[PDB]
């Protein structure tokens, strides 16, 4: 059997695509055969995303594995909910409920607020960015207004790259003017590195400060520079390297060559590529469960236009979504099981702290506890 899917990868996601290839070649079974059509594009441009989605719907794909940015969430979600085409996305979970979007990144607002309450913080700064939406910002603001905190929220997204040092220095001077010893960084692996370099330049990594890296990847960034600074920093970690599955994967991942698999010759692994591996596993398991129950999901090449009127959804889309949401497996990110809305439930986030000898796990946050 041939089950055609589609792949929407951003311009620059090399390690993610390498992990996708590793998962495709590793999880292949005999019940079917995935034939993904890859289409690298710019996810932040809604026009290119619409063009790629229509191009891949013109082939009659079954699902579409792809990323999206805050400027393209609505296009992807609306097209998927209207045309009845699933969408496995390792990006941030959309705000609210959205059918036919099988999100893969576990939530962080709960664990973030739990860590804030654990450290018993009352006044702190919160440097955020509008890349992954403004859900965490609103959650933090509401929790602070309910628990009477002093949050100093600052958008560091408009920092231009030509004179970033001056703006960062002025920002940290203004933060010191209010005596802000606690800072929560909510950025990706690049803005976090930039802010860390600026902190080191301005000399604030000395003992007496505390930072919280608000992202599922702690060891992804450059931590060998703040480790010996004196200040204690904490963060979250979805993919732990102490498990047996992650260890067996890394033992066969660091040995790969960077020429064939770009970004593979490394000991660590970004959590987005781990979610990509798990997404390949989840699609394979869903197709196996559909083929085991003898569900004839074979659709002819009558896909036709992409923006037809009226947009008629095929009768097998809801079946594929139901089979994809009812998949419970164990992967690199941990236990994978989705609720009715597609969001991830029953996960586990390993909270880490950067000691002088390295990051050490101090506990695990869940949703039931």
């Amino acid at each position, epitope marked *: 059997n041939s089950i055609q899917i589609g792949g929407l990868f951003p311009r620059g996601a090399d390690q993610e695509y390498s992990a996708f290839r590793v998962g495709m070649v590793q999880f292949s079974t005999s019940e079917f*055969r995935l034939t993904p059509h890859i289409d690298n594009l710019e996810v932040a441009n809604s026009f290119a995303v619409t063009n790629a989605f229509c191009s891949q719907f013109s082939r009659g794909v079954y699902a579409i594995f792809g990323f999206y940015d805050k400027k393209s969430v609505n296009t992807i979600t609306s097209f998927c909910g209207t045309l009845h085409v699933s969408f496995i996305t390792p990006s941030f979970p959309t705000d609210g409920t959205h059918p036919f979007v099988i999100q893969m990144r576990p939530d962080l607002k709960g664990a973030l607020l739990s860590l804030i309450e654990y450290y018993q913080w009352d006044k702190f700064a919160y440097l955020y960015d509008s890349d992954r939406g403004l859900s965490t910002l609103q959650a933090v603001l509401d929790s602070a207004a309910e628990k009477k905190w002093q949050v100093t929220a600052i958008n560091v997204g408009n920092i231009n790259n030509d004179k970033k040092d001056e703006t960062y220095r002025s920002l940290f001077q203004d933060l010191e003017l209010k005596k802000e010893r606690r800072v929560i960084l909510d950025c990706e692996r690049d803005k976090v590195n930039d802010i860390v370099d600026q902190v080191i330049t301005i000399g604030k990594h000395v003992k007496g400060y505390h930072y919280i890296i608000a992202n599922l990847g702690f060891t992804d960034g450059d931590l060998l520079k703040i480790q010996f600074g004196g200040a204690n920093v904490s963060g979250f970690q979805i993919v732990d390297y102490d498990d047996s599955l992650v260890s067996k994967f890394i033992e*066969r991942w660091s040995t790969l060559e960077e020429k064939e698999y770009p970004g593979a010759h490394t000991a660590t692994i970004k959590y987005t590529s781990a979610l990509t591996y798990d997404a390949v596993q989840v699609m394979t398991e869903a197709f196996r469960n559909l083929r085991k129950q003898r569900i004839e999901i074979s659709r002819r090449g009558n896909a036709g236009d992409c923006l037809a009127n009226p947009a008629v959804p095929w009768g097998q889309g809801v079946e594929i979504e139901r089979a994809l949401k009812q998949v419970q497996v164990e992967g690199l990110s941990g236990n994978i099981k989705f609720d009715q809305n597609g969001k991830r439930i029953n996960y586990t986030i390993n909270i880490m702290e950067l000691k002088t000898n390295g990051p050490r796990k101090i506990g695990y946050w869940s949703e039931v506890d």
Partner: antibody
Amino acid sequence: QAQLKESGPGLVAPSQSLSITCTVSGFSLTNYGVHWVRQPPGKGLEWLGVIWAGGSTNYNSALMSRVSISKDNSKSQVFLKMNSLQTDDTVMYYCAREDYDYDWHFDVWGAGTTVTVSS
Amino acid sequence: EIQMTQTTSSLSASLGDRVTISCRASQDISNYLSWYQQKPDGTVKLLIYYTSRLHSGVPSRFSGSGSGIDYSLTINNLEQEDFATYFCQQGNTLPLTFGAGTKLELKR
């Protein structure tokens, strides 16, 4: 560098079984799958079967009653045991390792050993 | 089974020329074709994957094109090493069928 060295008997009695082996060096037989092809004299190769990395094997609808691939991940080997090898069934049997880079390609292909089942 | 059948059975052209071997499939292979090269000694190797892109480390002279059923691989400037058989496979469904291909020879 991943390489499959197809080592076979080279000759066998008529209507008798024929067992060849392939020892993939550099590629773990549990992570990447193997696929066997048969090229006749001066003709295009025909895929006989494949033993996926998960352990499940899928064979061609023609040689299904004859071909049977069995993998040993510990010894890192894949053996093809085709019984009732006829004189016309004597062709160059080769083994390759599939990959995935924007399409399902067979990257590393073994040199293959000639087999002429004749009494 | 998608029976990928090559167009020309055999071709002959001297060095310094550009040849183009074409193949056609039964059903739509969805541009998931691959052109490989088989030498006389038995050594096979990949030349063009996904019917559009050449493999890693292949000679830049050889290229591919053609979407749908028909797909053609064209050599830019022939040479002595380019004189070998060229086969085509369609990895869109099982059993993966390969084409007999044509062997380019040196015109004398």
